[PDB]
Point group: C2
Chain length 238, copies 2
């Protein structure tokens, strides 16, 4: 006969824009493509994440924990101003780079003060890290095991720590594209910025997270399959 | 109200897979308020070679599969089990008081007394500071092409996939009648599950999850827990 373990059963049954939209996330992000690449001409991100003491850690009942920030944490790119709302994680990564996913993907979700949209910053987490990632760590420690339950972090959580390090040219290369939320209702009009430089992380933390995703009784994943690019193009700021 | 869910594959599996009342894996109650019936079976005695020349196969269903020659014998309850092959599942397929471990190793045997299959399950825990060399070689030698096999250059010591003897010289375990955990999910299999996990490095658990994801993602290859039904788990603690 013919059989597999297959993928998680839920995502191909999500309704509304999840099924109908044509600007859905995530997507494959070509790198080693011969195909020529539209430059984003947006310049480089600058971060003003200061108001990061006093955080809530929330158990979404959807695998990941969610760190909620108070107003005042700002990032700038192009002329646009981005106010940080929350961050969370996916394992394995949601976006892919030439077909290949990573151990985790961090999602920093912002209100886009300039467009009225949301903007999601996306960072790849790789295994190999010698230092625990402090933001990830605290998110792991504080996160209520009871689902739906949220409780305030006693430690401060610096979300800049989820950003890749600057290159040997001042930059943090990224791709930009219009897409959606990767969970229901998958609303569109989200600006996606996926950085190309992964951050290394001790394997303990990746297993700790997949453990959290598995209700602390197994190891599990919380990722959506890749979606068609369709009419879009991806903008590179390499 | 929406979710990611469990993998979509196993609930569709047909045959005995879907109809059997004696299926694996199951939950192994330890700290329960129910009486534990002792298996009274004695302890395992292992005579496994230390540097076996093995074929490593890519099952094309997640795990690689290490095949052995004859000579690797496990003795229990006055029976002779011979090792056919090992492979892995991530997370563990058995649970223990509801909880699964990072991986489970399955050492499959032919009961030479009976001719029926027996499987030994060992939990693999993260935390380990020492690379387990059997899992290591199995990851290294595993052919990339599905259903292909390649002989290993290095010997494999399958005893490395078994837990150390305790302070009292035991390797406590549980015994129950079950099935293959993959189609045809044939029943009549004797399951022995060791209570003591082995620590392996987090690197290797991830390597394995990577293999299951065919080097492009991180996946699992575990069947969901089954109902004990009318069955009894017997204990050798
Ligand atoms: C209010 C809000 O931020 N909702 C989100 N839903 N999904 C997100 S994701 N995984 O696509 O970044 S963010
Ligand atoms: C021939 C044979 O042994 N087939 C098996 N299929 N699944 C196995 S498991 N995971 O239940 O040990 S063994
Ligand atoms: O090889 P590592 O990146 O899993 O330590
Ligand atoms: O050879 P063993 O069964 O004592 O390890
Ligand atoms: O069978 P033994 O020699 O390991 O006790
Ligand atoms: O190193 P640990 O935290 O995975 O046991
Ligand atoms: Zn997300
Ligand atoms: Zn198995």
């Amino acid at each position: 006969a013919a059989w597999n373990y297959g993928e998680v059963a839920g995502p191909p049954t999500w309704k509304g824009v999840c099924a109908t939209g044509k600007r859905q996330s995530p997507i494959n992000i070509p790198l080693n493509t011969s195909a020529p690449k539209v430059d984003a001409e947006m310049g480089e991100f600058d971060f003003a994440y200061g108001s990061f003491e006093k955080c809530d850690v929330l158990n979404t009942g959807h695998g990941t924990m969610q760190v909620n920030f108070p107003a005042g944490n700002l990032a700038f790119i192009g002329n646009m101003e981005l106010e940080l709302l929350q961050f969370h994680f996916h394992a394995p990564s949601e976006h892919a780079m030439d077909g290949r996913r990573y151990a985790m993907e961090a999602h920093l979700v912002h209100k886009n003060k300039s467009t009225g949209n949301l903007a999601v910053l996306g960072i790849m987490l790789e295994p190999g890290g010698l230092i625990k990632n402090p933001a990830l760590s605290t998110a792991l420690e504080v996160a209520p095991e009871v689902p739906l339950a949220k409780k305030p972090s006693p430690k401060g959580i610096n979300p800049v720590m989820l950003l890749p390090k600057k290159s040997k040219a001042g930059t943090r290369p990224f791709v930009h594209y219009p897409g959606s939320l990767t969970t229901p209702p998958c609303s569109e009009g989200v600006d996606w910025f996926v950085f190309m430089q992964p951050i290394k992380v001790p394997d303990s933390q990746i297993l700790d997270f997949m453990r959290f995703v598995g209700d602390n009784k197994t190891y599990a994943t919380n990722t959506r399959p890749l979606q068609l690019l369709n009419s879009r193009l991806v903008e590179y700021e390499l």
